[PDB]
Amino acid sequence: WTATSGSCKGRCFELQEVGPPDCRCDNLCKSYSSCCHDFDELCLKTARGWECTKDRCGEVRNEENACHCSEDCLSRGDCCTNYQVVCKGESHWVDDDCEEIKVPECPAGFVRPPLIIFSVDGFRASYMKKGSKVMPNIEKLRSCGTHAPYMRPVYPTKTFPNLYTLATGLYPESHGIVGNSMYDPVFDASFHLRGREKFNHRWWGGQPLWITATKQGVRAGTFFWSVSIPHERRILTILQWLSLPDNERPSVYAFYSEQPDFSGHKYGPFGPEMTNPLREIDKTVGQLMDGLKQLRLHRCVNVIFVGDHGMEDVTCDRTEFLSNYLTNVDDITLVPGTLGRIRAKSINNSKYDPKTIIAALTCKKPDQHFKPYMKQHLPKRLHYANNRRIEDIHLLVDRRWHVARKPLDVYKKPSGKCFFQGDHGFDNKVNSMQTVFVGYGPTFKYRTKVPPFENIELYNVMCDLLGLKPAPNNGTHGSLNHLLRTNTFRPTMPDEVSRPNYPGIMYLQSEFDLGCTCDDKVENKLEELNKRLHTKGSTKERHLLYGRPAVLYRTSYDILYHTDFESGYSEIFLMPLWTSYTISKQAEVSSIPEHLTNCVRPDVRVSPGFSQNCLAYKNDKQMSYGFLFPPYLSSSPEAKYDAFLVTNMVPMYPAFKRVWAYFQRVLVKKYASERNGVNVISGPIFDYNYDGLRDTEDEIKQYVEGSSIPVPTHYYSIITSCLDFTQPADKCDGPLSVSSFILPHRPDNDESCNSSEDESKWVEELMKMHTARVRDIEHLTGLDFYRKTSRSYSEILTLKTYLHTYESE
Numbered sequence: 001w002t003a004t005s006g007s008c009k010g011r012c013f014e015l016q017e018v019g020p021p022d023c024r025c026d027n028l029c030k031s032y033s034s035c036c037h038d039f040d041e042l043c044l045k046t047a048r049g050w051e052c053t054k055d056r057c058g059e060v061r062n063e064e065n066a067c068h069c070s071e072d073c074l075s076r077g078d079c080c081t082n083y084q085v086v087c088k089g090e091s092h093w094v095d096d097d098c099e100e101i102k103v104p105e106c107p108a109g110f111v112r113p114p115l116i117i118f119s120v121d122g123f124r125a126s127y128m129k130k131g132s133k134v135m136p137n138i139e140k141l142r143s144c145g146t147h148a149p150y151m152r153p154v155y156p157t158k159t160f161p162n163l164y165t166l167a168t169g170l171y172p173e174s175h176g177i178v179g180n181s182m183y184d185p186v187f188d189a190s191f192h193l194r195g196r197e198k199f200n201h202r203w204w205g206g207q208p209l210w211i212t213a214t215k216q217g218v219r220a221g222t223f224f225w226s227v228s229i230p231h232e233r234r235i236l237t238i239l240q241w242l243s244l245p246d247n248e249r250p251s252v253y254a255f256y257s258e259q260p261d262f263s264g265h266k267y268g269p270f271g272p273e274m275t276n277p278l279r280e281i282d283k284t285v286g287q288l289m290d291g292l293k294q295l296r297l298h299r300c301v302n303v304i305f306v307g308d309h310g311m312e313d314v315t316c317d318r319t320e321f322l323s324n325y326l327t328n329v330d331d332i333t334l335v336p337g338t339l340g341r342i343r344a345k346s347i348n349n350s351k352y353d354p355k356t357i358i359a360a361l362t363c364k365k366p367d368q369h370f371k372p373y374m375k376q377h378l379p380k381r382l383h384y385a386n387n388r389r390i391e392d393i394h395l396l397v398d399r400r401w402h403v404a405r406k407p408l409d410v411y412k413k414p415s416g417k418c419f420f421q422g423d424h425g426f427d428n429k430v431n432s433m434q435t436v437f438v439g440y441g442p443t444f445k446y447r448t449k450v451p452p453f454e455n456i457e458l459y460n461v462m463c464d465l466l467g468l469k470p471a472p473n474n475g476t477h478g479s480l481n482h483l484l485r486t487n488t489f490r491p492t493m494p495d496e497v498s499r500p501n502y503p504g505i506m507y508l509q510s511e512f513d514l515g516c517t518c519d520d521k522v523e524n525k526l527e528e529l530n531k532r533l534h535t536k537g538s539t540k541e542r543h544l545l546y547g548r549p550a551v552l553y554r555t556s557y558d559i560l561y562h563t564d565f566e567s568g569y570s571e572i573f574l575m576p577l578w579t580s581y582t583i584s585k586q587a588e589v590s591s592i593p594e595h596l597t598n599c600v601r602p603d604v605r606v607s608p609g610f611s612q613n614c615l616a617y618k619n620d621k622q623m624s625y626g627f628l629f630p631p632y633l634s635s636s637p638e639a640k641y642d643a644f645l646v647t648n649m650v651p652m653y654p655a656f657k658r659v660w661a662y663f664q665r666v667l668v669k670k671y672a673s674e675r676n677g678v679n680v681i682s683g684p685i686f687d688y689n690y691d692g693l694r695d696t697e698d699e700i701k702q703y704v705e706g707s708s709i710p711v712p713t714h715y716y717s718i719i720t721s722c723l724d725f726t727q728p729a730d731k732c733d734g735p736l737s738v739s740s741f742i743l744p745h746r747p748d749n750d751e752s753c754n755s756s757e758d759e760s761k762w763v764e765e766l767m768k769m770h771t772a773r774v775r776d777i778e779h780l781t782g783l784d785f786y787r788k789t790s791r792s793y794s795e796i797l798t799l800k801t802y803l804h805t806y807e808s809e
């Protein structure tokens with residue numbers, strides 16, 4: 001109940017929210033059906049429109065008008081935004097030459113430059129170039145300020161997950177808004193775009209920027225606008241708030257536009273109907289900038305122009321139907337569209353089985369346009385599993401497609417034809433899903449292009465712009481320092497927690513009873529000292545190029561040196577946490593010699609009690625083994641024996657060994673050829689609770705049969721070279737270049753529909769799907785890489801957030 005017979009007189013767009021049953025006058029009151037009776041009359045004036053004209057100049061104030069052109073309007077803070085242009089001979093902001101903003105130029109009483117976030121729903125990254133001729137104001141912000149060629153959204157590339165990621169710095173799995181539609185089994189409650197459940201605070205986790213600001217004494221505008229409030233009135237409202245006295249005036253503001261998304265769904269991303277929405281958004285930016293200029297704030301305010309996601313061509317004819325795959329289609333609930341989420345229709349149905357649903361959905365039709373996954377098997381870069389609101393069964397839908405349960409879901413009578421031509425929600429690496437970032441103002445750089453980055457990083461920067469301490473989030477604070485003129489965040493590297501042991505030769509061959517064998521008894525004062533030097537680390541500068549990784553948790557591990565590679569060997573997990581090696585452009589690939597095919601050699605530096613054993617693998621009929629440093633890339637026949645050390649062995653399903661052997665035998669050399677040498681760090685990952693974070697020992701769900709050898713959920717590699725590929729990886733003077741992956745360690749290759757073919761036809765495609773940031777691997781391993789370079793730490797942080805996407809231009 002709302003007692004709507006209170007009044008909005010002197011309260012229009014009030015900042016403090018009033019509790020029911022008192023009536024509201026704020027920018028969201030319409031959405032709750034709670035505005036006071038006179039809110040339209042007083043707060044939503046429209047008389048005479050939004051622009052001054054020649055004959056209104058100096059008019060007698062008329063309080064009915066939408067905006068004013070009277071002499072007093074500047075002191076009232078309510079002139080039409082073009083007032084000074086029409087009436088006082090001023091230029092529009094867009095027509096002024098751009099001039100560097102070296103220092104904030106703010107009116108007296110301003111404690112900090114205000115921040116305005118201008119959010120555009122569905123604004124695809126390529127609109128910045130493709131629409132630049134019809135967007136002069138946006139083009140001036142872009143060219144004069146700091147811009148990225150695109151900004152990567154989070155998955156799923158839907159509105160609420162992305163807007164809330166922008167506001168919190170959190171992945172959707174952590175902030176809880178995991179789709180535009182959700183079911184929470186604990187609450188037993190459903191969240192939808194339409195309706196009232198979405199306003200309940202229990203859906204919304206983390207700490208969004210407006211709350212962070214308010215807790216730390218920085219006042220915030222109310223960020224959200226009821227859809228029927230016209231854009232011109234949103235802008236006027238912001239400009240009016242900026243005229244409040246110092247003690248009452250917010251420092252952070254948000255504008256939101258439902259366009260170009262609204263038209264993009266109807267017309268497709270590049271429909272000819274899309275030009276008009278882009279022109280209208282540009283005109284709104286112009287209104288805001290003209291308004292700031294009138295207030296003498298256009299060289300004071302930092303403006304962020306940012307989108308939530310892009311838009312792809314999707315039509316209802318490109319829909320896959322689960323009714324063509326599943327017998328039991330009425331026993332499932334599907335969240336449909338550009339992603340699929342499946343769960344049981346009834347929790348009372350004990351005949352429901354996820355295994356049989358996955359199998360019925362796996363590689364069934366030659367050109368199938370979706371792929372099913374248990375959520376823990378989704379690419380780790382999506383960070384889309386650790387939330388009870390994410391159903392166990394997920395469908396990744398190809399770009400340009402939909403999935404639905406049955407045909408009747410997609411049509412309506414009489415004709416059955418559908419309407420829409422655009423949609424979004426697909427994999428956040430998809431080019432059509434990318435969106436925009438421009439920052440303009442005193443705190444941003446002048447005429448500066450920055451590389452693409454992820455929207456999870458922006459919360460930290462917005463906090464920096466406002467002098468706030470960010471709440472704990474998934475950005476990497478400092479990774480976007482290069483966007484900023486000042487207010488940089490200068491982090492220090494994390495302290496190492498565990499120091500390594502450096503074991504020497506401590507065990508005789510006969511102390512080992514591991515059940516391994518090797519044909520290695522091939523029996524020189526010259527060369528003996530040489531092998532001893534290798535074991536003490538004489539080649540370590542070649543193979544460990546950026547320092548040893550730091551171990552950021554408590555554990556016992558050993559550094560092991562060899563001719564061709566260095567490793568950090570965990571006595572707890574019985575295998576390396578990391579193995580590091582450099583392959584120059586000139587390196588040659590060799591075979592595993594016949595006499596060494598099944599060779600595994602005790603490591604006399606490591607106790608039998610802290611070693612794997614071969615008997616366990618013999619007895620585990622499902623599990624085989626591979627090596628982290630690959631024997632194919634040994635520097636000589638003699639160094640090759642080091643590769644068969646039991647301390648270089650890791651458990652691998654035979655299906656996985658197909659993938660790994662091809663990576664090691666073919667792809668590493670290919671990358672060294674193309675990149676002029678590579679440095680490779682490889683290792684295991686254990687994430688059995690799919691939280692994106694390193695498992696402790698007591699979280700491990702699977703061991704090699706009969707043993708304490710834990711089975712990795714994933715294997716990673718980090719592949720580093722010189723950004724200037726005219727320098728070899730091992731003699732690089734400047735910035736680095738990286739690509740990495742986190743490959744799921746699966747007992748089958750059911751994910752790759754073409755796996756019965758030669759690895760040259762499917763393995764690299766798999767690895768691209770599982771591309772990763774170094775930071776992703778850091779979270780999953782508790783290691784900290786690139787500790788010793790010649791590069792600045794913020795530059796390294798940017799490198800650690802890089803994702804190599806394998807998407808064309």
Ligand SMILES: *[C@@H]1O[C@H](CO)[C@@H](O[C@@H]2O[C@H](CO)[C@@H](O[C@@H]3O[C@H](CO[C@H]4O[C@H](CO)[C@@H](O)[C@H](O[C@H]5O[C@H](CO)[C@@H](O)[C@H](O)[C@@H]5O[C@H]5O[C@H](CO)[C@@H](O)[C@H](O)[C@@H]5O)[C@@H]4O)[C@@H](O)[C@H](O[C@H]4O[C@H](CO)[C@@H](O)[C@H](O)[C@@H]4O[C@H]4O[C@H](CO)[C@@H](O)[C@H](O)[C@@H]4O)[C@@H]3O)[C@H](O)[C@H]2NC(C)=O)[C@H](O)[C@H]1NC(C)=O
Pocket residue numbers: 170171173174175176202203204205206383386387388472473474691692693779
């Ligand atoms: C991305 O960045 C984020 C933010 O930094 C990282 O997330 C953090 O990760 C931490 C580790 O997973 C986690 O720390 C835990 O906090 C628990 C208290 O949590 C509440 O309080 C915080 C602080 O205000 C709040 O933010 C939380 O919010 C979550 O939950 C609410 C309500 O459900 C949601 O609205 C919200 O969306 C958010 O949900 C997300 O996180 C939770 C986990 O907290 C998930 O379950 C959800 O799926 C979703 O992803 C909470 O309201 C605290 O209880 C934990 O301590 C337990 O574990 C330790 C181990 O050290 C143990 O020693 C303790 O005894 C305790 O165990 C007891 O409970 C166990 C489980 O019930 C039980 O098994 C034991 O036997 C014990 O009884 C823990 O410290 C932190 O909460 C989140 N923060 C957020 C915002 O998500 C995230 O990791 C980053 N991601 C990557 C990939 O890097």
Ligand SMILES: COc1cc(Nc2nc3ccccc3n3cnnc23)cc(OC)c1
Pocket residue numbers: 117119159160163164166167223224225226227254255256
């Ligand atoms: C959800 O979390 C955030 C929301 C917004 N804003 C808005 N999101 C909308 C989403 C759908 C429909 C209308 C919407 N709207 C209208 N007026 N403002 C908004 C901004 C956020 O950060 C700057 C974070």
Ligand SMILES: [Ca+2]
Pocket residue numbers: 121122158159160261308309
């Ligand atoms: Ca959107």
Ligand SMILES: [Ca+2]
Pocket residue numbers: 686687688689690691692693694695
């Ligand atoms: Ca984990």
Ligand code: NA
Pocket residue numbers: 616617618619620621622623624
């Ligand atoms: Na075996």
Ligand code: NA
Pocket residue numbers: 749750751752753754755756
């Ligand atoms: Na297959």
Ligand SMILES: [Zn+2]
Pocket residue numbers: 122159261262265424
């Ligand atoms: Zn949309």
